[PDB]
Ligand binder design. Sequence first.
Ligand SMILES: Nc1ncnc2c1ncn2[C@@H]1O[C@H](COP(=O)(O)OP(=O)(O)OC[C@H]2O[C@H](O)[C@H](O)[C@@H]2O)[C@@H](O)[C@H]1O
Ligand SMILES: [Zn+2]
Length: 249
Amino acid sequence: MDEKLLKTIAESKYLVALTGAGVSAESGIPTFRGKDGLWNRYRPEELANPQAFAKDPEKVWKWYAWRMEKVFNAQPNKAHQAFAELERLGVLKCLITQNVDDLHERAGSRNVIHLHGSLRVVRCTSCNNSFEVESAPKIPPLPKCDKCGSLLRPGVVWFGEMLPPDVLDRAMREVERADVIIVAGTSAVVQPAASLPLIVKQRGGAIIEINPDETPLTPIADYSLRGKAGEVMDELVRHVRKALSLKLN
Ligand SMILES: Nc1ncnc2c1ncn2[C@@H]1O[C@H](COP(=O)(O)OP(=O)(O)OC[C@H]2O[C@H](O)[C@H](O)[C@@H]2O)[C@@H](O)[C@H]1O
Ligand SMILES: [Zn+2]
């Protein structure tokens, strides 16, 4: 939290952010990897891939319905609140997230790109049709599409599946013009999301990493803050807001 970092943020021309599961950990939602990560307790091979869904849609749906309830009942934390505020202040231009929760939105963030989909969305496996839900469905029975008599599935991106072209292209455009990118709460291993911060660096921008652990991105991060996103972002945005308020205008 040195003056150099604060200056980089407060004076940025087009700051964007990329967030991962770590930004929602302080909301009581576990992450995917690490200590008590979901992929350490559960097997992604039976829950997060098209083959697993086709093999046992009931098992996959029961798990996602559980995750949905957990997310819908959770509250945004200080990190989510801080990103929303950084956007309100006119500093953060776009928030790109790998998270399938809607905590960024519930905290007030407006320009959000969901690279991996959302637990709020459910769609048909047959016809190209989707819609959002207010609460989690009960499983069984299997959620069915009332547009062609087929199965509905969680509107999230599974391993091996292609991220929607329009979504990734938009995110790509955002990082192509960003001069600063805050990368918070992500392990930087899952592609193509992990490649986004590299674009910023290759084009001449700065990377500000926020994570209690070091990651594959750490070596090229201009700044790498070892701490929880809630604490770090709250302090960072408060200092940025203060700095901006001091400007003679
Ligand atoms: N309070 C916290 N504040 C900031 N970061 C934290 C916090 N707590 C944990 N982290 C960090 O969050 C990171 C989470 O890494 P992942 O669990 O791999 O989450 P993510 O990078 O978003 O996963 C990417 C993708 O893979 C999953 O299969 C899924 O599709 C997901 O979107 C870890 O590096 C971890 O150290
Ligand atoms: Zn359908």
